[PDB]
Each structure stands twice: as C-alpha cells, then as structure tokens.
Amino acid sequence: EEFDAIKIALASPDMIRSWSFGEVKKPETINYRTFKPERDGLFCARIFGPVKDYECLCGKYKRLKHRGVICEKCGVEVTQTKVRRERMGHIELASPTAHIWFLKSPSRIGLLLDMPLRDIERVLYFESYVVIEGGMTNLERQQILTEEQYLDALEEFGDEFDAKMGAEAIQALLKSMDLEQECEQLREELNETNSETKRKKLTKRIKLLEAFVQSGNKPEWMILTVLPVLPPDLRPLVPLDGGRFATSDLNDLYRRVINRNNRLKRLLDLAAPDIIVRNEKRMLQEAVDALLDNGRRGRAITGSNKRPLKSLADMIKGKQGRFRQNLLGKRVDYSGRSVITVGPYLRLHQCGLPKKMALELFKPFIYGKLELRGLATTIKAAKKMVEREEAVVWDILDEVIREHPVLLNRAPTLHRLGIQAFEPVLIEGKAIQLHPLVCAAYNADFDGDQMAVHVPLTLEAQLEARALMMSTNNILSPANGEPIIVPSQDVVLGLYYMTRDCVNAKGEGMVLTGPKEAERLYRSGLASLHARVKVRITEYEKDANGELVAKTSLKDTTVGRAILWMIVPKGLPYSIVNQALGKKAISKMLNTCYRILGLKPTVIFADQIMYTGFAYAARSGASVGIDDMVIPEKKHEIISEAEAEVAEIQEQFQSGLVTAGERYNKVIDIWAAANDRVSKAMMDNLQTETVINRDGQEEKQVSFNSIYMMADSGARGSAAQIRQLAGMRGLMAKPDGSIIETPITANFREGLNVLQYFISTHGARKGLADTALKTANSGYLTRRLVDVAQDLVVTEDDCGTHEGIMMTPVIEGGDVKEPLRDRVLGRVTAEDVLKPGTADILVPRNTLLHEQWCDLLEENSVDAVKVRSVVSCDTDFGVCAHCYGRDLARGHIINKGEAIGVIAAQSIGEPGTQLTMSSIQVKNKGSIKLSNVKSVVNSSGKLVITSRNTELKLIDEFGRTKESYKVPYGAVLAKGDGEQVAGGETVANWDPHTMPVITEVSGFVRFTDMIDGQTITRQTDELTGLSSLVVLDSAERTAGGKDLRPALKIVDAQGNDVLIPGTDMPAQYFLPGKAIVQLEDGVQISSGDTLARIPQGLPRVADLFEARRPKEPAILAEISGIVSFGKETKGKRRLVITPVDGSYEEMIPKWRQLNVFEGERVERGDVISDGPEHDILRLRGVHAVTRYIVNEVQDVYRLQGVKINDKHIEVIVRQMLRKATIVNAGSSDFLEGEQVEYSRVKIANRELEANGKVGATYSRDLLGITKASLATESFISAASFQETTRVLTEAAVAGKRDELRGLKENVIVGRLIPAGTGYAYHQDRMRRRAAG
C-alpha cells in the first residue's frame, strides 16, 4: 500500500504492451438494440473486465460452477468486477506517428538535433524529403531535399545515399546517432570559443545529450508506435433516465484512430499509389493530435455541437481539468448552508444551529446511540425512528451534540480567521445563529450572506476544533498587536452615551459609598447616566509578585463611569474608564487588560461588554431625523460672495488676459475655497450651540446633536461624512476623471438639481465599476503569493549563525513615522547591544523583545539596534524560532512545528481588497547632522556643497531624529552643519529648474576649447551684453566639433590650470547643452557661484513583488575610479572608466541628463543617469536590498490605512532569493545558477578541508516570483496550478522524481500535511528512513 516516492520517464513501447490487457481493434461499443458490451470492442469484456456478479454473457460458466474458466465461446471470464477503472487497453499502429507535446512546443526533439522546426515541417507534413544518411561523403546529414532535387540525387548516384520522407525518416535519425562522440566533442570546443549565444546552445545540449545518458531514457520512444486506451469508466456511455444516451468525449476521439488506422492496413494491402499513401499517414497524426491537443497544431476540430472539443490533455489543462479544481479543492459530505443572524445572548464559544438541519446532518451519529439505548433494534429500524417524532430523538440529538464543536465557513476566505469552530446551541428556527462580535473577523454584515457548516467526525480534528480553532483560542490577529474583537457598532455606542460628563443630570455633588448602590439611586429617578458625582471605590493592584495588593480611594467621577467598575477584574486603574470611551480607547482597554492579567479574563470580559452595550442603549435610544441635521444661515452669502467673482475672471477672460490654465485653476479654487470654510460654517454653529443653564448664566459643553456623538463613538464615519449632508458635498467629475469647474450648492437636506443628479452617477457608477474589478486583481495576487511560501515550516531552535538586519525608525519625510520600539517589539536581538552609558549589554546575544523590555528602549534615548531576520537564519528547509521572535497570532514565543509563510501569504493578500479606495524649513530645535559631505565656504559665508550624497536631517538634542530631507547637489545654505539652529529659520534655497555647475575652485575664466561654428553658437545678450560662449544641445550643433569635448578652462594669469585644493587633476568644465555661461572673458569667478545654470497602488504592489525592472532604470556606478567619456553617438554614448588600480564602456541614452562630468571622480553606489532605481543586489550587500523593498510596500499600507508587520514581507524576500550564479568550477558545472543552500553544501564538503580550493564562488540570484514556482525541484507542486503541458514535458525528458516534501504534495495524495499536528508524525517517518 504505502509508497515512499514516485518516478516519471518516457514510456517504451515494450512498457505499453506490458501495461495493457488486449488490443482494441474495432470501434463498436454497444449494439443498436441489445445494450451490450461488444466482443473485440471498446467496452470489451475480453480486454477490460466483467460487469455483473460472476455472470458471463451467453450463459455457460455461471454461479461459481467454474471458478477460473473463460467462456471461450464469447471470450468472457467469471471473475470479480470493478476493474473497469484500473484496466487499460492498447493498440498497435502500422505507421509510427509523433507526440505533440514533444513536437509543437524548444521542440525538444528538433532541439536535440539543432534542426529547425521549419526543417521538420517539410518532413512531418509530407512536403519535401530529407536525407537519412548519405552513404557517400559527398553530401552531409540533415539536408532537406525537394522531390525534384531528390531525383537528381537519384539519377546521379542511386545507391550511395539513403533518404526517406516519413516519420520513420525521423525514427531512423534517433536509432542511428551516438552521443558519447557528440557530448565529448561539445566538451572539446566549449573551451575553444565560449562566446555566450553560441555557448548557451553548448550549455543546453550537454544537458540534453547527457540527460539521456545517465538517466536511461532513449529518444526512440519520443515518437509513438503504440498507444494506451483509457479504461471505460473514464470514457463511459451512459443513458439518461429517458432512454437517451450521453457519452464522454473520448469515445469519439478514440474512434477516429481505429477507423483511420484500419483503412491504412487495408489500403496497404491493395497498394495504393504513392501519392495517396502519403495522405493516409497524414491523417493519423492529424487524428492522434486530436486526442492530445485539439486546437494546437492547425485549424480547430469541432463536431455537431459547433464548438471545440475537450481533449485528453484538456482533462488536465486549465482549471477545467483535475489539478486546479478536483484535487486540491473538492466536493465534500457532512455539510450544508444557511443564512446568518445575530445573537445577543450567545457567549463567544457558543453558536446557534437549527434542529432540522442537525438532525438531518448528524444522522450517522444517532444510529449508533440508539442501539446503545436499544429502543431501535436494527439499522433499518433506527431509520424508521426518525420520522416518528420520538422525544428520545431530541434527547440523543443534544447528547450527541454536547461537546462536539462545528466549523463555519464563508466565501471569500481572505485570511486565517474566515473559518472558526464554535460549539452548537439548538434553537427552534431555520437560520444559523451567530455571535455578533465575530463580524470583525469576516468583514461581513447581515444582508443574507450565507455561511457553510462542517463537522469534524474523527476524534482528532474534534480536538483541533477545541484546541486550535475554538473561537477563544485566537483573539489576536496576525496583522498587529490589537485584537479583532474591537466592538463594532452599538457596544461602542452604548458606552459613549453612558460615560459622559455633562452637568445636566440631577444628583450631582453628593457623595456615594459604592458602585453597587448607584443602582439604588439611578434607577429610582434620583440619578442620571451622566451626573458628575464623588464616589469612594476600592481598586486593586499587583505591586506584589502576582499577588493582589489592596487600596481604597475616592474619585470625583460620574455615575455611569462607576457602573463599569462592576465587571473589571481588579487590575486596571479607575483612570482607564475615566473618558468618553471611543473605539480608540476600548480596544486598548482590552489590550491593556490582557497585557496585565493574561488571556482568559479577556474572553470573559468581552462577553460582559457585549451584554451591557445593548442594555444601556435600550435605556438610551438613538433617534435620527431631518431636524437633527441643521444648515446654518451662512450658506446664502458665502456662495454669493464668490458668485460675484466667477464673473470677474470670466470678464478678465473677455478682456483676453488670463489663459486657459490660469483661469481654470482659479475657478476651481474659489468655488472650493469656500467649501473648505463650510466645515468652519458648521463647527461653531453646531458644536457648542447648546444652552443649558446650571448654577450660573450658561454653559459651553459637548453637543446635544446626536450625530457628533456617533462619530466620536466610531460607528459610521467621522467629520468628513457630514460634509456631504450639512454643507455642499465637495466637487464632482467625469468617468474620464477631470475635475469640475462648477461644484454643487445643494445637498441631501434641501435638494439637488436634475443635472447635479445626472453628473452624480459619473462619480458613482465608475466608483462601483472600479472596485467590482478590484476584487479580481487581489484573488489573483493572493494565489501566487501562497505558492512561493509552500515550503516554509520551522525546523530548529537556533542556527546560531552571523548577525543580520538593523532596527531603526522610518522617520524621514516629516515627523515621527514608525516608533522603533514597535519594530523592535516581537523579535529577538541579533548583536550584543547596550545602553547609551557604555557597555550595559542587555542581551546575552539574543533577547525576546516583549513590551516591558520595549519600555526600556523607549526609556533610554538610544535608537539603533540589530535584530535577526530570516536572511541571517540559515537552517535548511525552514526558519528558526530564535529568528522569528513572537508568533503575532498566539502572542507568545513561537514554537516548533508551525507554518510561517502561508500566514503571511494570508496576511499580505487580505487588505489588497481594502486598499485602493522651494526651500526646506526646520520644525523644532535640537541637534544638527549632515555628514558624508564635501562642501565649501561660499562668497556668502555659509555651507555650500559640491557633492551628491549630502542632505539635511533635523534631530533633537538627545539623538533621536525628528526630520530629514533631501538637499540637491549644490544647495545654498544659511547656517552650518554641527551648529545650533533655532526653530523657524530658513536654511536652504535653490532654483528648482537649475542644477548648478558652481565653481568650487577660484580662478580666471577664458574662452577655451570652443570656437564658434564647431561645438557652440554665439548667442550674445542683446539687452545686457553679458554672455559667454553659449553651448548648444545634443543634435543642433556641428558634427565637426561633436567629437571634441568643450571645456571652459579655469586659468590664472600665467597660463596654468587652477587645480582643485588637494589634487593635481585639471579643473575645466566639460559643459553639455542648454547651460549658458553668464560672465564674459577675463572675469574672475569666485568659489561658489554659477558659471552656467542648467534650467529645465495595487498594480504598484505588482511591481514590488513580481520582481520587475522599470522601463526607466536609473543606472548606478559599476566600478569606481577616474572616468572619461567615449564614443560619439553610434546608437548611444559610451563611458570610459579607468579605476584607481582596477580594470568597460557601455551604452548611455544621452538624450536625458547625465550626472557625472567628463573628468569627475565617482564612487560605486552613485547614479550616472537620473530616474528611479537587481543592480543593488549585484554590487551592494544583502540587507540594503531587503531595505528598500520593505520600506516601500509597507509604506503603501500606511498611505491607504493598513498596518502589517514588516516581517511578513521579509518572509517573502527570503523566498525571493533562492539561487546563485557560479563563477568557477572544479567540482561541478561552471556558470549555471543553482540553489544557494546547495551552494553552501559543496563549500562545506570540498572547499572545506577535504581540499584547499576546488570549489566555485557565487553571488545571489533573483527570479520573477511568478516563475520561481515554475523553477523548482518538485514538479507536481509546479504542475498543479500553471502551464501543465510545459512542466510535464521537461519533467519527463530528464527522468525526475519527487520526495512529496511540499505541503501541496501531501494534500493531493491524501497523506498527512508536514506541519502542525502532522509535523510531530512526519519526523518519525523521517527517522525511519535513516534507521531502516
């Protein structure tokens, strides 16, 4: 039964006859009246099997009278039935014909011979001949001969050449050739001329030739001679209920072989003329490929449907076949669907269920219990006792049900928490009841969205539904550290009414004694939900070690705030419930509750926050209407005061002054500038307009509007959604999407126009045509994200290897962005790291970083620390728990056995659905840092820089930065670096159009190396007079000086070049186009003044993961050193670099602007063109490669409001780097890229002390991640989902095998998964290999 591995190779035609049972020779299936399997037919009993029990056809050997006897009259046996699925048939052809997976696609057979497919297609279509073997050496092999030049090759010689035109003519070319003569002659000249595009075919064939050698495959089998026939339970012929028949498609397709093969062997017997026998063998490969690939080779083939047919491979191709729809996902018994509904009385681990649904579903579990009762006697008796309405039927039902938890499912599953496992409760209904608080876990609401249901029949999964998936095991989501029982709508509202601080309530000022007795006073009508009343309480703290210490204090509090103290389990301060309790405070008030008291109180707690949240809303009542929405009177004049101005710039536009853009950008502004102020119109008129008089004159307090108490609650929206009600609703637009000139003046309280309702569709139908195809693009993006992560399961506690990445904030751009401690939180430190007073090392090379040790890092001002990531972990076939830190879902130390990747592949692909919808100034005071700077003191006193890598960063005095901004090459400043800068002082200034070529040296100017008419013009300034030699752009000037680089030489009075301070390099500016040098000849220019100015999403995520280069890559600096320039525009500019001691000239699209000049020094890690920026993997390290990607796509979620821990994306970057191109050889091949782990293997067996150096060095590689699943060692993991025709060709030509190691492999075959509960199994399977 049990098998370790599998194997695939090309099947020999000897293997086919040994597979089979008998040769199908006639197309007959059933007779026209007697519905019978046919002798020598397709459904034949003499080949394929028996049908009825021990019963032959004609009636000779029956009823076990003759055990092993064939009815020799009709040909049929007696033996045991149901082999009609296992028993294949076969057929022997007359002329051999060709596989179409092995011909149409490289071809893989003409690719073997280096012969064109067009050279094949004259042969296997019967157009012209080809040589088999020239007997004389006059001709040569692989030579197409036309039939008229064939006769010339006949009538010259006749016998000294051999040549057919047939599939045998290709069959003879495989039997003839040897490989050991070729693959050691491809060895001979791989070392002769290793130019790549000729050598890459010497790469592929020494694969392909030596593929066949050591494996045992032969290319003779690669053209079919025998065929296998599917057992007829795959090609049935079924009736309907009404006497009408309906077949599989392959009975038709198999029929077209057996007739057309028959009228060859008969047409051979009559010796048809040599024209017609060609077309006879034509039609076979026309109809053999009709089995394999219907619409592949020529025109499609359809029948009476007038639609194309489903082929043989189309049963495995696409999702119409078996890999994508019937193997991974399935149908299933023991299940059902119904509608959801709420329950305000279920607890969290419970859920409702119908009686009629469960009694119909649990029917196998009742028939066991009734025999243990004995009221039912047998099985058919017990089925009778369902309809008869026994009280014990519903006394065994509940007794079956109790402690048997039950799954519920909803589509689309978008993450892990879409399926859960509650406990049943019965109800007298027909609709699945559900807890209200799990509607955050589904993004669902109650509009009739149906839900599935499932039963774990075994003992083991019933424990999984109790230990793993029971709804109180997992509260904390794997996206962050805040729970998912954020209370949704009314429980956030029932609190916000109750906790409040007005003066309205009667009873304010007298003192109470305890939060019990407020019941005796508030319900009696002496108290109010909000009345500010001094109360004496008794709180509890844990200042001992897990032991309660008592205290008792008084609080000038309110009455409704005091009743919340009746539940909270004596660990939290009274200050935590002393606020308005919005959605912001409540979710932390669960978070702080299980920060202190552990988990299990916070599942009892959220039960008793739901029961109160409806109950004091049922006291309150929240009622809305038209009177609650109030328009202020400042609506008439505010639009009228601009309405006199919309004819003003129109009257300018009648005077012909203002252009199109300057008037369009001003009509959009003043129409919306007042719309900015309609928020200011309704603020002071509708926030404190209330006047309730209480021991004074008036009072200014919270609003009595019953709308602003709904948004500070958190139920629906905030102060931007009222603007579509109270004021005007912003602007409008077209489905093209250009912004409108005239926005709206009406709303939902007064009434829009018939045109304002016309253009309102434009923003709304597009706004639903946008997202109805934005749920497709994420169910794409999720499906390949779960495929790179299908190998990832933890193995070991520690690798113990070298340190990794470094934790810093991301605070660039503006203020604080990400707290370092939160990126620190959840992890294990890498490097031995200390406190800013020296050598107070708080780690023993590794510490788990929970929240109290995060408080230490917020205490100290230090802000740089290293933490192991998955890159620095190097256990093979997994990651380690000492490099993962905290499992964010379970919330403690990550164990051994769990998955890693697919939780992140569910994390990242979930909110893609919920996503898509000058001078630099200082902010506050502190320290100043601007380093990697080479600069100058200008003609104005301050720091003027002449380098690329410089930029401004603003810090406090402690060291933790507040701001940072890019400053350009050549920015004028107003203070110095390493000085004190006050708040609000203008530091930098630069023209945005120009990039300065400012002189860092100081010398005279001279009009050198430009003479007018060769490389320049003369463009004098007719107004001023001041103009130097005006350089022209790249295409206008003369070619006679286009090979001469134009340089204004900086000269002194003697005739030298004024050198740079420090160097002997000559200082002259090789100035490119558009850069008009201002000052004329003989003028001394300073240090630091311009000689010339040079004046001027979710598919975005699908760049950042799909490993795509842009269309405009910004080139970096390859190798540093003193660089020159090169050739003059033979397609593109070339770049002559000469290093300091090292060793390249390559294309430059010079129609953009370059950075570095003709004789300026560059260092590696510098752009040489402008633009956006693989190169960073090629020349830099590894950590900075992961840095730019993690700080870009996590950045996307902050922009559109999602939070995801950056580890999840870092999990993919490790699966984004698997491969290693190799330089040397000695142990293996030379330059083909391979698995980096295995490249760390052969250093550890041969570069290690077995040999001093015999190995090969290697960089890191990077595939596209849509093909990194196709470029794998397992193949059914790659054949399950995409391109199934290709991946089952190349798997078979090489003779691969599988180890069933991926988790997609153990699930298709019915094995146990190698993770979780089953990981503790599979190592005993793993330890039984090495021991036996």
Binding site: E403, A467, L468, N473, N895, G897, T1317
Partner: protein
C-alpha cells in the same frame, strides 16, 4: 474545559502535542473504555482528557509508563 485549553498548554508546552497526547489518551477510553481519573461531570471523552491534563496527570511519558508496566505484566502472562 468548555471555554479554555490554554492552561492545558502551560502544562505540556505545545498546542499541537495537546491534539496528540489527548487523542492517545482518549483512544484508550473511546473504544478501549478504561477508567477515567477525574470524575465525569457529564462530559464527553475529550473533556475529561483535558481536565486530566491541567493537574499534570497525563503526559507523553505517563502515557508510556502506564503501558510499559502494562506491556510486560501482560507479557509475563502469555507463557
């Protein structure tokens, strides 16, 4: 118990072994039908197994020491 198996994990040390070491425990009482250690309290076999766990009564070693005395005491009976 009905609500919580967290304390059952602070005993063993593993969420997945709990699915195994209770199943190995309850399979001696589902069809093996042996005597339970905790009182029943009207519960199915998966609930008494987890109530067994919290006081430190059924471990991976205690599931094997209970059989290894019982193996040889059975294997001192056949001859």
């Amino acid at each position: 118990a009905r609500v919580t198996v967290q304390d059952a994990v602070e005993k063993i040390g593993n969420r997945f072994d709990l699915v195994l070491v209770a199943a190995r425990r309850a399979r001696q009482m589902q069809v093996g039908g042996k005597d339970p250690l905790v009182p029943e309290e009207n519960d199915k076999t998966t609930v008494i197994a987890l109530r067994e766990i919290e006081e430190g009564l059924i471990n991976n070693q205690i599931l094997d020491v209970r059989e290894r005395q019982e193996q040889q005491e059975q294997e001192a009976a056949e001859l």
